[PDB]
Amino acid sequence: EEKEVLEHFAGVFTMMNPLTFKEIFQTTVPYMVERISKNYALQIVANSFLANPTTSALFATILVEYLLDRLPEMGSNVELSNLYLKLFKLVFGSVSLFAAENEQM
Amino acid sequence: CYEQAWYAKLGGVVSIKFLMERLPLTWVLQNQQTFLKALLFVMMDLTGEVSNGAVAMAKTTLEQLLMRCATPLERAEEIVAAQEKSFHHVTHDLVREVTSPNSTVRKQAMHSLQVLAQVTGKSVTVIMEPHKEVLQDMVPPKKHLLRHQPANAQIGLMEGNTFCTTLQPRLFTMDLNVVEHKVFYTELLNLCEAEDSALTKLPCYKSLPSLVPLRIAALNALAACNYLPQSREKIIAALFKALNSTNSELQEAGEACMRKFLEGATIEVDQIHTHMRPLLMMLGDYRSLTLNVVNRLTSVTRLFPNSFNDKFCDQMMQHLRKWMEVVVITHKEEMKICSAIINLFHLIPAAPQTLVKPLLEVVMKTERAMLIEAGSPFREPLIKFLTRH
């Protein structure tokens, strides 16, 4: 049931207009990334928020924007490098899910 | 250490660490040079995919070794004789290759000299004096012209020149009066002047059109050449041609080296003002201001703070009006322009406090137009601008 309470929690953000969607998570992505560090399962939130907001696809844009910045840390902090790798693989899978409109981003 | 598989080099280095730490120093001094040669080769060899942190291991062990060996001692005289013998050997070795083509070892050698000097009651030059011979005949480039050596060797030579001439006693200070010093100076000056691709066609550089690190090294070479007097005009002209370069990486390097240069001709730029004129006439208009223009402005004003006055601030606010309108229109790049435009005012003095109200007017207009309060790009430069006064 947690695997669905998280789904609902992530979904609560989807319906609002993209113009506010981009800002709300542009302002707070790093904190949730840090929180996921001690939650092997909480990344389900990000997974759902990348899959269903495929109708938005902006979350992926800001996620890659942040991961580009934090890239050098990967390969040194093994524990966090793992999380970065998971997120990168997820965002790469995103474009596979949406061959359209993800190539642009 | 000489096996080509990095995990063998790591075994060598860990053996070195244990041997250095465990055994008494009287024994360590005797093999200091062997240790140093092996360790330096470890990092010299790996310049493709390096390792799982072999080079970091090597550098840490090398600095540990130097600190352990050079530490002053009871001061039994035989130990002192061994210590000074080993120190002379190590200093010779390190001085030998502060110009080496391999950068990863060049920078490590320079930093090693720094730490070695700092560890003891002596200056870098004080420990370099008995080894000037090892560096006499090339740190001023002898024999073939600079264009005939390979590019990386050129970078090594000029970096060694800048390091040697930066030291306050200035070992091997150059002078245009002497032969082949004017040749070196003029050759690298022309290199700087070769901003156009017309001279990148040359065989010695056409093989790699990157060209940027070489020009950075040339700029540093010019900048370290401030002490002699008669270069003012050409050095400044070249440096300000660079500061106006569209290459952001080159622009920031020019900014950085102008710091060192301005210990000489501080305000000859302001007096001349034609080094900055190539900016003014396009600095008006309505749309001429791209990201490069604003970045150059904030650069050339971060140094020479008095470079601008109130009326220029008014002109800049007038310009800001356009982009403030344009960003909101387009969203209904521009914001990257506007953020830099705002940040600029924070840097320049002589900006009237009266401009607070006008610029704040347009800021609020556009933020309301975008209906954004959190994460806006304009707050941070506003905070910086206001906090000072």
Side-chain angles (χ1 to χ4, degrees):
Chain A
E1 63 297 35
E2 191 175 27
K3 291 157 68 74
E4 200 183 313
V5 74
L6 296 178
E7 152 53 21
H8 294 293
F9 172 84
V12 316
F13 295 87
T14 303
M15 61 305 297
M16 61 195 148
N17 184 288
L19 177 57
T20 78
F21 180 112
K22 59 181 288 181
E23 304 307 336
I24 175 58
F25 276 94
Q26 173 160 247
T27 309
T28 188
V29 61
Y31 168 77
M32 58 170 285
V33 167
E34 189 282 336
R35 283 290 87 196
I36 284 163
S37 75
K38 73 145 290 302
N39 287 290
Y40 168 80
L42 194 132
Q43 69 95 359
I44 287 165
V45 175
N47 179 19
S48 313
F49 208 50
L50 180 65
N52 158 22
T54 45
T55 59
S56 170
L58 300 182
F59 180 63
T61 310
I62 68 166
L63 187 65
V64 293
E65 291 272 44
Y66 168 61
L67 264 289
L68 262 306
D69 179 26
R70 196 156 289 283
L71 173 48
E73 183 177 308
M74 196 195 353
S76 182
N77 271 101
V78 178
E79 64 290 331
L80 311 184
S81 77
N82 302 344
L83 318 169
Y84 305 142
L85 178 59
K86 304 320 188 181
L87 298 159
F88 256 122
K89 288 162 67 169
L90 261 65
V91 65
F92 289 144
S94 183
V95 54
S96 83
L97 308 182
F98 267 48
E101 199 278 328
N102 290 187
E103 170 150 274
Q104 198 62 240
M105 54 74 81
Chain B
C1 299
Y2 303 99
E3 268 68 72
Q4 72 175 326
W6 57 261
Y7 40 84
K9 302 192 195 297
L10 268 176
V13 175
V14 173
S15 307
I16 285 272
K17 181 185 271 279
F18 179 89
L19 268 43
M20 143 174 51
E21 287 179 356
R22 183 57 52 119
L23 289 92
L25 180 138
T26 61
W27 173 91
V28 182
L29 297 174
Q30 306 175 28
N31 308 276
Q32 183 171 359
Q33 185 163 35
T34 297
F35 302 145
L36 186 144
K37 280 182 176 182
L39 287 161
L40 187 139
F41 181 85
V42 163
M43 52 205 88
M44 190 294 283
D45 182 7
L46 305 174
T47 50
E49 183 281 327
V50 184
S51 62
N52 292 46
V55 290
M57 192 85 238
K59 288 189 283 189
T60 48
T61 39
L62 172 57
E63 284 177 42
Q64 273 193 260
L65 177 65
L66 291 191
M67 158 292 307
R68 176 156 167 71
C69 294
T71 288
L73 311 172
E74 83 306 329
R75 281 138 294 289
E77 52 267 33
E78 74 291 8
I79 311 178
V80 181
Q83 192 164 34
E84 65 188 339
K85 184 182 175 77
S86 179
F87 182 91
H88 176 279
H89 287 75
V90 169
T91 40
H92 195 305
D93 184 344
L94 276 158
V95 170
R96 188 181 311 112
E97 66 306 12
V98 303
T99 63
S100 59
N102 184 330
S103 66
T104 290
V105 61
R106 178 171 69 250
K107 289 197 292 192
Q108 183 56 30
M110 274 158 13
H111 170 79
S112 190
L113 278 158
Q114 302 290 18
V115 56
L116 185 58
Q118 178 270 2
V119 165
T120 69
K122 300 174 183 174
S123 76
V124 176
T125 65
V126 165
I127 62 166
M128 283 205 178
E129 294 305 341
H131 298 108
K132 294 178 295 199
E133 303 88 339
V134 196
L135 198 62
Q136 270 171 349
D137 48 339
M138 91 317 300
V139 78
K142 290 288 196 283
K143 292 202 289 284
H144 301 292
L145 278 60
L146 192 59
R147 266 171 281 116
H148 293 173
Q149 296 85 353
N152 166 305
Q154 303 176 34
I155 289 178
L157 285 174
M158 311 177 5
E159 284 208 319
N161 261 266
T162 50
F163 175 92
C164 292
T165 55
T166 294
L167 301 186
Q168 316 82 1
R170 283 200 288 285
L171 266 57
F172 292 113
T173 175
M174 91 164 314
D175 174 10
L176 271 57
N177 290 274
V178 191
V179 58
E180 52 71 12
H181 284 166
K182 53 174 67 73
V183 174
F184 173 45
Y185 164 97
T186 48
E187 182 60 48
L188 70 92
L189 169 66
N190 273 280
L191 205 174
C192 292
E193 279 279 21
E195 187 73 355
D196 50 341
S197 61
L199 292 175
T200 70
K201 294 156 61 179
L202 292 173
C204 39
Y205 304 126
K206 184 165 59 179
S207 55
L208 177 49
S210 182
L211 295 158
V212 167
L214 186 68
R215 300 174 76 68
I216 304 325
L219 257 53
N220 278 267
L222 286 174
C225 202
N226 64 78
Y227 57 88
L228 59 90
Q230 63 266 37
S231 57
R232 305 303 89 158
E233 174 266 338
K234 260 161 282 292
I235 277 178
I236 298 165
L239 286 178
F240 270 75
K241 182 167 167 173
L243 272 170
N244 282 285
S245 187
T246 298
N247 286 321
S248 183
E249 159 52 8
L250 178 57
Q251 204 293 322
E252 66 97 42
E255 148 74 31
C257 75
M258 183 65 33
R259 310 300 193 77
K260 295 95 184 182
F261 173 74
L262 284 176
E263 298 195 348
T266 317
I267 62 163
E268 301 191 30
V269 167
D270 176 284
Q271 294 159 353
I272 288 287
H273 182 64
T274 60
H275 296 116
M276 309 88 92
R277 280 291 302 281
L279 241 192
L280 273 289
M281 60 295 297
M282 58 232 76
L283 186 52
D285 201 62
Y286 200 50
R287 71 226 93 190
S288 170
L289 315 190
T290 181
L291 302 173
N292 173 253
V293 179
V294 58
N295 199 28
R296 282 154 63 187
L297 259 297
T298 179
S299 178
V300 302
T301 204
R302 198 173 310 166
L303 72 181
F304 320 113
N306 71 299
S307 44
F308 297 110
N309 62 359
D310 48 19
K311 73 99 193 181
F312 175 72
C313 298
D314 182 23
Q315 289 179 252
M316 257 331 312
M317 181 314 306
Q318 207 276 356
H319 291 307
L320 168 66
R321 182 182 57 70
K322 179 200 164 62
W323 309 104
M324 252 302 165
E325 288 170 28
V326 167
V327 63
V328 305
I329 290 161
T330 51
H331 281 189
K332 187 178 295 189
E333 293 168 293
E334 320 315 321
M335 85 321 298
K336 284 164 180 162
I337 293 167
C338 289
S339 50
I341 299 280
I342 301 304
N343 180 47
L344 157 58
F345 293 104
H346 165 230
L347 285 307
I348 69 186
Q353 290 276 45
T354 66
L355 289 180
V356 168
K357 167 184 295 186
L359 74 92
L360 193 58
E361 285 172 49
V362 68
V363 164
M364 270 316 79
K365 173 183 288 187
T366 48
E367 280 206 323
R368 190 176 70 190
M370 280 322 106
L371 191 50
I372 61 179
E373 177 179 314
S376 73
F378 316 101
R379 178 175 281 99
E380 175 285 336
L382 265 279
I383 293 293
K384 288 196 307 207
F385 169 51
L386 282 318
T387 194
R388 84 189 197 178
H389 52 190

